[PDB]
């Protein structure tokens, strides 16, 4: 059902609990953009699950044993040994976070004319691919773009779409396949092991490389153990190890499923690409022996990755998010289904049907959510999407992203009860109008006002 | 109505979570005594709320700023300034925990042969009083001894009983009145402000001193704000300050409402007694500048005491315990009422009516609770009562209970549901619970080391 | 010679560096009593080596793994296993510090008429002995009371004095022998292994118990390895284990050679006395599973005791103190000889020969030391000693007590150079006059003024 | 004259301290390359002063108060307020370390084909400049290239060389002047305030921007207070603020003079460039609210930067390095002069005159230094210079040196004596030092992974 936290609270973080009238003032000062809210003014911060996790006592013990040597740090040897043991890859290069590893991989495996195809995309990953002269091709199955379609493993790659790309464009013009686990843009949807095995079968026949975006791979591994038949007797670690056996490398953001506040790494099996990675990491991140991370942070990441393999931890992590989604779904609140491993996405298109998409319903829904409850959420609709056009995506959603081991079921009830009350008078949600807008990346800095 | 935690989780503590068949092995290795269980084998440890609290990020920041000087530590000045500000007492002496401060007070304010009267007693406090030649007299009102009587402020002192003591026994023969907030032995029951004022009024008329046992004074202050009329507009800090304005001093166990894992102190307003307190703390605890505590621990206690004054914290603290008690009461599980500020007491006599008290139902109920849920609780019945010194029979108490003591800021409502659901399932087939028989029994304090086996 | 610190600095403590004119004001506000100085106003705090030590990264890692359970804490099992391994005793009871263990032992092994004899005494130890109705008898050899006599192992017990006590008073009237390692009052002087072996031989023949005051036992073990023939091939741990094989138990203040800021314990081999110790620790310290200590503090003490067995640590610890004494002795400054393991004692009797003992030379020397350098020292002459008399001891000294791993050789040079300059114009040191004096323990609270 | 540490040791780091015969084994396993040594096998690690510093108790207290929010973290506001207060710049963007900020600045202020001129260069800074289509021009005064010339402020820019560049190359074709304080490649040599003012005067007349490489700016500020007339009455903070008043921005590696183990930031006054900086930091470092750093690390850097402004700290920092250099110079050991703010450079060409540069004397000297003392140092000569891209021969530099880089607040004078005494003993029989020959050599960056064997 909904198991209790498989841990005790070792230490707590003090938070401000300003009343509604105070929160309304803070939201007005922030231009009705949740990205501009001060952390000190937020009760429950569901903006992202990236780097906001709570570490364990064992991780903080490693923090006291930081070997800050520039080369040969014991923390690096611990992290290297851990990733090689759990992921199975031959070579590891630490980076300060995920997009640092993406910067490395995109410069190492992309020729300025090749194609990169994957199960949807992420902002930072696609930028570095296109920065290095690649053209992105989405080969996820079409069901992944249907927010309400409740089917299992929506992140699976359409093998027919991949076969079409290899035929129409040729394998020589395909840089690599970028398989993401889980698929963040589809709502945190998992990829099945049979899909990873089938993708590896087709790519290996044409000499195409496969690189994983593994930031939420542990959450993906739980869905395999829970819903894919034949993996019920397999541990999380066994599933994680089998997942990466169908890849030539991976980029990892430790800030997610490694249960840390900073850190990432790049993995690969090819010796020659590892040599070029060590030469390139020096100018962007640092030495291959620390890669832009303090020694204590490599230690915390090595310990956190091993803690993520505990079944009871990852079961509670996913089922806490599912509890929030189930409570909203039972009250009639429209959400993306099925609930992903790391967040619940409110479908602002259905939530705010009385508002047009030019009126920023997701942004206005996120602003109202904070004022009524003190809960911060991230707009993931047209504004995040960015001639002189608006650019309209199918998904006008508000993301309630759950940090790991930070909040309780009672905190989820505060989020649910407030959204449910807000939904009961959803007609009151007003539209927004732009005040100041940069280019490139406007979701972070734009300001709005009620219409 | 059961608020969410007024804080986030900064860091977590790893637990093993062994399955039921493994927990049965651990319980058998522990002789069916929860006191002999290893901490590493316990999912939810409700043995005590003493020193088991979770500290805040600000407290751990103070832990990094420990001034470990033997004298004149800045951490002591911060603790001294904090207690003088919040409690109002003139002089402070730190101790390593509560019973260290009780050892000092009992030697400073008791002449051999005098009487000490209080709203019931505690084990360590009464020992140091009687060790120094005092005779304890219970002056709590009779309603406190009714486990099922659900009334407010059961810890209040019966003013007539105190008046009777002053009349039958000379006031010169009364060492002091020991007012405890809350009253742990009655189930964590609070004392009203009107009672503390009346006690201060009566004792001041006869020159009698009043010293508070304030280990859970903050929980007591919340009950005043919630249930005593006239205090709804007053903050927790204002209530705490008014409480101690009716006392000449106090002994504090910081391990409770100061939100720390170690620490205590002794307070008083009398200059002459403070001089003797500084001379006596040297031989038992340490210098008056640290009193058996590391500097970082005085800092954490100074910060934690100020954090306890937050209304939202203490409201959630009390209502989390109340949530556990209400869920048990709604399922028909017999508990001591009303629910105290820090624990829920299962009535093991009614829970295990098919067992006699010679069969240790509370001890057997605690063992089954761990096996079914991984929750450790404390037996508070015949085993804890011990044996009589001369006749060598069982000290048979009216209360055969199992104490579910909640550490502060450590567990969630979901953890309380684990405790409730397991006890409720165990209660639905309570007839299966077997009795226990001694297989090893020490000479004194038997709850800690005794071993048992099923009958 | 004088080896470098066998460790690196992991973290530093910020200290105030007020000028001389500021320090003079602070000293006047403190009534010229170094005990009343604020820690924030002191550059180098040499008041005591008790609880002022710097812990290691491994100890602070254990601090993050505090098992704060009331019973069955893993930290207790670590501490118990460590002491049983290194000391060899069968039973251990943790206490909040040394005088807590002394309170326990004195109530368990003293009948209100028996004698307690030891190599000199300490204030807290002798109080609890006399509190429980014992009469103290000093059986240290007479050479220990000669501050200038530079001989080895001045802390040895005079076997003839012990034989005289057993004959004149009988073994039935002797509670136990209290052997202290090292002897703090004699200047931190060590006890030889042959002495501990000979004492055990004589006491066992008469059924007398031997209990060690082992607060500085590791420093004692180094002197055995350095100066007693036959122990040069033996490690510190082997020497420590052999030392306690000649004792029935011990009281330990972890605040000394366990490299912690709080903590102690009581050891013994007798099962029946251990049962009574567990009953008595409950009313004074706490449960036998934590004994008035947080779980993290038991962990830090278990780790610190194992770190103390490293030869390079304890060699540098002793030789840093010796460096201070050698630099003062080479300049003509009168000190207690030989230099002990934990402190250097300035002989204020020779330092201030132009002042009488009624003028508190040690107290006035300590006050002047702070004003000129910002160094705090402890007066250990007549004032510490306390009819209506003054009570005159042979030793009018000023103790420069060195915390472990806290200061460097450069800090010792600041102490030495300032004392040497002060000694060159020692005639300027003025006498003191009492302003306010309590009874029982007057060194802590008394105030003075210049004459 | 060599002051004592202006602080106490709060906590220590455990070291192994293996004997000489064991260290020889470790050095052979590392192919006689100090870069391949394990940190656990090193007594004194003088490889770099970057990110190896010891933090204070106040910094570790801030580490416990990490606000790990993705946006609007209080730690960012503290860092932003601190840099704006101490440096005077209008806008701040955090980065994970210095070369992250250099990556941003090079893409923001360089159009392809422009010139970048500075007082010598650094490896990472020059790479990002040339990666973005710039041509580097050295405008340091000629005295900086004389290793033995003991003069003050060798890092000053030759104003005539800058005037010549503006004349021969149009000012529109000059991206910016990159003024580094201190100059690491010249041995950590400082830049005078009069030079920074003259550079600002000349560049402002032609509309040219000036950006500082300020990683060791605090050490530079001490040299101004110590050796430049007119600044003896000014505090370190006042000097730092005046230095940056002659710049339009800066790139900072907090891993140096901010007393942290990770962190950096990018500063500027131009509003338009700051808008582009926030857009570019997202794809490389992270949000402008954390920029690739944990919240606790921004807090530690904010606290450490304020601690670096203490005169007594930075005086001891510089004079501890000077103590090592003076002890070597007094024994006849050849070093680069004057001693820089952060390291001492051994002249391995003179130290090992019996060896040719093809025999890697600096690499062989570093290996012997570790075997005799357990001290790791960095080879800074022919091996670090690498090979030419086309012809494939050795890049032969004038400086064949061994760098003894001192982390801040990590070691004592006794540790410096260990370094000096071992090098002095090694110098007394320097003829025994053998040459090295390649047994494994990578394709690029060979100092890190290459292996050697004795000839
Ligand atoms: C699937 C996947 C991710 O979700 C991911 C980061 N997610 C993020 C962080 C983010 C990044 C950009 C704008 C807003 C928020 C999330 O808020 O969801 C990265 C980058 O890793 P990094 O942030 O550690 O560099 C790679 N792949
Ligand atoms: C040999 C020996 C000791 O030296 C010792 C403490 N020394 C102390 C501490 C102290 C105690 C009383 C007055 C002043 C200073 C020292 O400053 O030198 C204790 C008590 O242990 P505790 O302080 O941990 O209770 C037992 N034996
Ligand atoms: C009202 C009151 N006053 C003083 C003290 C002593 O303070 P301290 O010395 O413990 O800090 C306590 C201790 N309460 C704990 C711990 C305990 C104590 C004895 C036996 C078992 C467990 C419990 O109630 O379980 C107390 O409740
Ligand atoms: C003046 C100056 N400006 C910028 C940076 C980059 O900053 P960051 O990215 O390192 O934080 C540095 C790095 N200095 C270190 C570390 C190092 C760097 C390259 C090779 C080996 C070692 C050293 O000098 O040894 C620097 O000195
Ligand atoms: K973070
Ligand atoms: K505790
Ligand atoms: K201390
Ligand atoms: K580092």
Short mmCIF file of C-alpha atoms in Angstrom, two decimals, chain C residues 173-358:
data_model
loop_
_atom_site.label_atom_id
_atom_site.label_comp_id
_atom_site.label_asym_id
_atom_site.label_seq_id
_atom_site.Cartn_x
_atom_site.Cartn_y
_atom_site.Cartn_z
CA UNK C 173 42.31 -2.07 56.93
CA UNK C 174 43.61 -1.15 53.45
CA UNK C 175 40.78 -0.53 50.98
CA UNK C 176 42.95 -0.55 47.84
CA UNK C 177 46.11 0.90 46.31
CA UNK C 178 45.39 3.86 44.01
CA UNK C 179 48.17 3.87 41.40
CA UNK C 180 48.03 6.93 39.14
CA UNK C 181 49.62 6.99 35.68
CA UNK C 182 50.90 9.47 35.22
CA UNK C 183 51.25 11.39 38.50
CA UNK C 184 49.69 14.77 37.72
CA UNK C 185 50.63 16.50 40.98
CA UNK C 186 54.33 15.56 40.69
CA UNK C 187 54.48 17.22 37.27
CA UNK C 188 53.14 14.45 35.04
CA UNK C 189 55.84 11.95 36.06
CA UNK C 190 55.62 8.35 34.82
CA UNK C 191 55.51 5.05 36.70
CA UNK C 192 57.78 2.23 35.59
CA UNK C 193 56.50 -1.21 34.63
CA UNK C 194 58.81 -2.81 37.20
CA UNK C 195 57.14 -0.66 39.87
CA UNK C 196 53.64 -1.72 38.78
CA UNK C 197 54.82 -5.34 38.75
CA UNK C 198 56.44 -5.05 42.19
CA UNK C 199 53.39 -3.31 43.67
CA UNK C 200 51.15 -6.08 42.33
CA UNK C 201 53.45 -8.72 43.83
CA UNK C 202 53.26 -7.21 47.32
CA UNK C 203 49.53 -6.44 47.31
CA UNK C 204 48.51 -9.86 45.96
CA UNK C 205 50.40 -11.54 48.81
CA UNK C 206 48.13 -9.72 51.30
CA UNK C 207 44.89 -9.79 49.32
CA UNK C 208 44.94 -6.03 48.69
CA UNK C 209 43.29 -4.64 45.56
CA UNK C 210 45.02 -2.32 43.10
CA UNK C 211 43.05 0.22 41.06
CA UNK C 212 44.69 2.51 38.50
CA UNK C 213 44.02 6.20 37.90
CA UNK C 214 44.73 5.81 34.20
CA UNK C 215 43.74 9.22 32.79
CA UNK C 216 47.21 9.74 31.26
CA UNK C 217 48.19 6.08 30.89
CA UNK C 218 49.20 6.45 27.22
CA UNK C 219 51.74 9.15 28.07
CA UNK C 220 52.98 6.82 30.81
CA UNK C 221 53.32 4.01 28.27
CA UNK C 222 55.56 6.14 26.04
CA UNK C 223 57.98 6.85 28.90
CA UNK C 224 58.27 3.10 29.46
CA UNK C 225 59.08 2.53 25.79
CA UNK C 226 61.56 5.42 25.80
CA UNK C 227 63.40 5.05 29.11
CA UNK C 228 62.77 1.59 30.63
CA UNK C 229 65.10 -1.03 29.16
CA UNK C 230 63.51 -4.05 27.49
CA UNK C 231 60.43 -2.20 26.18
CA UNK C 232 62.02 -0.58 23.11
CA UNK C 233 60.75 -3.41 20.88
CA UNK C 234 57.22 -3.24 22.33
CA UNK C 235 54.41 -1.16 20.87
CA UNK C 236 52.42 1.35 22.90
CA UNK C 237 49.41 -0.98 22.86
CA UNK C 238 51.47 -3.90 24.17
CA UNK C 239 52.77 -1.71 27.00
CA UNK C 240 49.31 -0.37 27.85
CA UNK C 241 47.92 -3.91 27.96
CA UNK C 242 50.75 -5.09 30.22
CA UNK C 243 50.31 -2.11 32.56
CA UNK C 244 46.67 -2.96 33.31
CA UNK C 245 47.44 -6.67 33.78
CA UNK C 246 48.80 -5.65 37.22
CA UNK C 247 45.54 -3.97 38.28
CA UNK C 248 42.08 -5.12 39.35
CA UNK C 249 40.40 -2.13 37.69
CA UNK C 250 40.78 1.49 36.73
CA UNK C 251 39.08 4.86 36.54
CA UNK C 252 39.63 6.69 33.25
CA UNK C 253 39.01 10.28 32.20
CA UNK C 254 38.67 10.07 28.43
CA UNK C 255 39.06 13.86 28.35
CA UNK C 256 42.82 13.20 28.58
CA UNK C 257 44.48 10.38 26.63
CA UNK C 258 41.32 9.28 24.81
CA UNK C 259 41.56 12.47 22.69
CA UNK C 260 37.98 13.61 23.33
CA UNK C 261 36.25 16.62 24.87
CA UNK C 262 34.02 14.62 27.24
CA UNK C 263 33.80 11.09 28.56
CA UNK C 264 35.20 8.50 30.93
CA UNK C 265 34.66 4.97 32.13
CA UNK C 266 35.23 2.54 34.99
CA UNK C 267 36.88 -0.85 34.46
CA UNK C 268 37.14 -3.96 36.62
CA UNK C 269 37.49 -7.73 36.38
CA UNK C 270 35.31 -8.76 39.35
CA UNK C 271 31.81 -9.85 38.35
CA UNK C 272 30.19 -9.00 41.69
CA UNK C 273 31.61 -5.47 41.81
CA UNK C 274 30.48 -4.96 38.20
CA UNK C 275 26.92 -5.86 39.24
CA UNK C 276 27.03 -3.24 42.01
CA UNK C 277 28.57 -0.72 39.60
CA UNK C 278 25.65 -1.12 37.18
CA UNK C 279 23.21 -0.53 40.04
CA UNK C 280 25.05 2.59 41.21
CA UNK C 281 25.70 4.16 37.79
CA UNK C 282 21.94 4.48 37.22
CA UNK C 283 21.35 7.01 40.01
CA UNK C 284 24.42 9.17 39.26
CA UNK C 285 25.38 8.88 35.57
CA UNK C 286 22.70 6.95 33.70
CA UNK C 287 22.12 3.53 32.20
CA UNK C 288 25.13 1.18 32.03
CA UNK C 289 24.68 1.34 28.23
CA UNK C 290 25.57 5.04 27.93
CA UNK C 291 26.47 6.23 31.44
CA UNK C 292 25.76 9.94 31.06
CA UNK C 293 27.26 10.19 27.56
CA UNK C 294 25.68 10.74 24.18
CA UNK C 295 26.16 7.83 21.80
CA UNK C 296 28.36 9.93 19.52
CA UNK C 297 30.65 10.67 22.48
CA UNK C 298 31.13 6.98 23.27
CA UNK C 299 32.00 6.49 19.59
CA UNK C 300 34.49 9.37 19.58
CA UNK C 301 36.10 8.00 22.75
CA UNK C 302 36.37 4.48 21.31
CA UNK C 303 38.08 5.85 18.20
CA UNK C 304 40.29 8.28 20.11
CA UNK C 305 41.60 5.59 22.45
CA UNK C 306 42.69 3.51 19.46
CA UNK C 307 44.34 6.57 17.89
CA UNK C 308 46.32 7.18 21.09
CA UNK C 309 48.12 3.85 20.59
CA UNK C 310 49.93 5.23 17.51
CA UNK C 311 53.59 5.66 18.43
CA UNK C 312 54.13 8.75 16.27
CA UNK C 313 51.18 10.55 17.88
CA UNK C 314 52.25 9.98 21.48
CA UNK C 315 55.92 10.60 20.70
CA UNK C 316 55.07 14.01 19.23
CA UNK C 317 52.66 14.73 22.09
CA UNK C 318 55.33 14.21 24.76
CA UNK C 319 58.17 15.78 22.76
CA UNK C 320 56.14 18.92 22.03
CA UNK C 321 55.75 19.45 25.79
CA UNK C 322 59.44 18.63 26.24
CA UNK C 323 60.34 21.21 23.58
CA UNK C 324 58.64 23.92 25.64
CA UNK C 325 60.43 22.80 28.80
CA UNK C 326 63.81 22.52 27.08
CA UNK C 327 63.52 26.02 25.61
CA UNK C 328 62.65 27.45 29.03
CA UNK C 329 65.35 25.43 30.80
CA UNK C 330 67.99 26.56 28.30
CA UNK C 331 67.14 30.21 29.02
CA UNK C 332 67.49 29.76 32.79
CA UNK C 333 63.76 29.63 33.59
CA UNK C 334 63.21 27.41 36.67
CA UNK C 335 60.89 24.49 35.90
CA UNK C 336 59.89 21.20 37.48
CA UNK C 337 62.12 18.44 36.14
CA UNK C 338 61.97 16.20 34.32
CA UNK C 339 59.28 17.59 32.01
CA UNK C 340 56.11 15.56 32.37
CA UNK C 341 53.99 14.07 29.64
CA UNK C 342 51.23 16.69 29.58
CA UNK C 343 52.50 19.99 31.03
CA UNK C 344 55.45 22.15 31.99
CA UNK C 345 55.43 23.48 35.56
CA UNK C 346 57.16 26.79 36.19
CA UNK C 347 58.68 26.81 39.67
CA UNK C 348 57.23 30.10 40.91
CA UNK C 349 59.13 29.67 44.18
CA UNK C 350 62.41 30.20 42.31
CA UNK C 351 60.78 32.37 39.64
CA UNK C 352 59.50 34.79 42.29
CA UNK C 353 62.03 34.44 45.11
CA UNK C 354 61.71 38.17 45.84
CA UNK C 355 58.06 37.58 46.85
CA UNK C 356 56.83 35.71 49.90
CA UNK C 357 54.39 32.82 49.71
CA UNK C 358 51.74 34.96 51.42
#
